[PDB]
Paper text:
Nuclear translocation of the p50/p65 heterodimer is essential for NF-κB signaling. Importin α possesses two NLS binding pockets located along the concave Arm-core surface: an N-terminal ‘major site’ and C-terminal ‘minor site’ between Arms 2–4 and 6–8, respectively.
The two isoforms adopt a nearly identical conformation of the Arm core, and the p50-NLS P1–P5 residues (Arg361-Lys365) are not only superimposable in the two complexes (RMSD of 1.095) but also occupy equivalent positions. In both complexes, the p50-NLS residues 361RKRQK365 occupy the P1–P5 positions at the major NLS-binding pocket, with Lys362 at the crucial P2 position. Meanwhile, importin α1 residues 75–497 are perfectly superimposable (RMSD 0.26–0.39 Å) in all complexes of importin α1 bound to either p65-, p50-, and both NLSs, underscoring the rigid structure of this isoform7 that can stretch NLS peptides at the major and minor binding sites by making extensive mainchain contacts. The p50-NLS occupies the major NLS pocket making 18 hydrogen bonds and two salt bridges in complex with importin α3 versus only nine hydrogen bonds with importin α1.
Numbering used by the authors:
A (entry chain B): 436 to 442
B (entry chain E): 75 to 497
Write the structure that this text describes.
């Protein structure tokens, strides 16, 4: 569904 | 690492640079992989401030930091995405698509993909706010290769979310608008871009025949077949799903998949070491042997019947279930001489062995294919030779036992074979 952007 | 309290005191300074530093701090908290404190940020009331920072054209950094922070809140549960939509974020993110700074418009693309990715409602809400025009405008270059790689992959992924989900499917005019770009991305040479483009096509082909036709008419089946033969599993998986979706349609929509050469790849797919590939490939096969007799003939000519016999003999149970459906469809629509051919490929004994499975539905489909095969033998007069074959490989004990078990549709069809073919 979704993507968190990381460091 | 700042506390949420200090972020709050910083965001409430009415000092733009203090707010910028506090928004960085929030952004870094929300970008940590192990429990990001999304609910704490939401519960502190920070979302309306973040949304207001999206409109600060003068301070592009705080635009980027807020879009970043909001992106990760929208990446959470449906409630946390709701909190972002409830703060007015959709119109603000759509304005940011026009940002002269590439990293900021990219961040808006990403955030809108997270919102649309929540489900049908937010996806259609993103569309009603007019996101499709500025998104497509970002891909309006003569050659996609002049776009930055990560930039292009975020566009592709967000567009695929706009194609995603049913109940309801995306609006018809929205998909007509997206498809031309989507086919371009389907011919791009980046694997990540190809994979998400294939996923979008698989979503669009997951519905009634009218939706299938709309994709087939854009001419993507030859490209889907080529991606079917790729070495990258993340590409094959959505490509096979889209092909499998297309063969659920009409017989002539299925014919376009056969004409593109898809069957030549299936020896590989039906022996693939990845369970899901085998299942989806067998499921696709089941919907092709549900077609016309000349379409069953192409399955035979491509040498796929022994591969169906092998997947029936040894595979994960879900794959064996799809194989049984393939044979029942084959036996339902095939000529008697395709049926004869199926028996000479060794179908009987793997088919008898699956009669001891503890699943009531696979049993039902297998009896129904045994019936179909007998009726073919009945037009040749070989019902005696067949009943011997079924008895000789241990299949008659199975039917006798099935003749008396729970389900009603089985034993009414189980006794039918006993008192019509064994006496």
């Amino acid at each position: 569904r979704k993507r968190q952007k990381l460091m | 690492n700042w506390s949420v309290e200090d972020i709050v005191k910083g965001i409430n300074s009415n000092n733009l640079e203090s707010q910028l530093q506090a928004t960085q701090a929030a952004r870094k908290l929300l970008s940590r992989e192990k429990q990001p404190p999304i609910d704490n940020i939401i519960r502190a009331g920070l979302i309306p401030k973040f949304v207001s920072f999206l409109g600060k054209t003068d301070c592009s950094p705080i635009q980027f930091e807020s879009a970043w922070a909001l992106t990760n809140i929208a990446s959470g549960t449906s409630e946390q995405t709701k909190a972002v939509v409830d703060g007015g974020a959709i119109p603000a993110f759509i304005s940011l698509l026009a940002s002269p700074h590439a990293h900021i418009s990219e961040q808006a693309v990403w955030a809108l993909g997270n919102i649309a990715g929540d489900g049908s409602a937010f996806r259609d809400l993103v569309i009603k706010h007019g996101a499709i025009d500025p998104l497509l405008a970002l891909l309006a270059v003569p050659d996609l290769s002049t776009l930055a790689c990560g930039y292009l992959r975020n566009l592709t992924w967000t567009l695929s979310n706009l194609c995603r989900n049913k109940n309801p499917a995306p609006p018809l005019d929205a998909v007509e608008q997206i498809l031309p770009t989507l086919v371009r991305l389907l011919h791009h040479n980046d694997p990540e871009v190809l994979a998400d483009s294939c996923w979008a096509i698989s979503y669009l082909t997951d519905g009634p025949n009218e939706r299938i036709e709309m994709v087939v008419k854009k001419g993507v089946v030859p490209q889907l077949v080529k991606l079917l033969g790729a070495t990258e599993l993340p590409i094959v998986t959505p490509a096979l799903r889209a092909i499998g979706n297309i063969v659920t349609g009409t017989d002539e929509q299925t014919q376009k998949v056969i004409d593109a050469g898809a069957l030549a790849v299936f020896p590989s797919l039906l022996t693939n070491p990845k369970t899901n590939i085998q299942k989806e490939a067998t499921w696709t096969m089941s919907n092709i042997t549900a077609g016309r007799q000349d379409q069953i003939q192409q399955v035979v000519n491509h040498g796929l019947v022994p591969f169906l016999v092998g997947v029936l003999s040894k595979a994960d149970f879900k794959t064996q279930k799809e194989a049984a459906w393939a044979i029942t469809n084959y036996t339902s629509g095939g000529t008697v001489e395709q049926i004869v051919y199926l028996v000479h490929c060794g179908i009987i004994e793997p088919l008898m062995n699956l009669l001891s499975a503890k699943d009531t539905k696979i049993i039902q489909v297998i009896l129904d294919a045994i019936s179909n095969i007998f009726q073919a033998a009945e037009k040749l007069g070989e019902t005696e030779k067949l009943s011997i074959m079924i008895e000789e490989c241990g299949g008659l004990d199975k039917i006798e036992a099935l003749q008396r078990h729970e389900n009603e549709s089985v034993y009414k069809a189980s006794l039918n074979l006993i008192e019509k073919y064994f006496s």
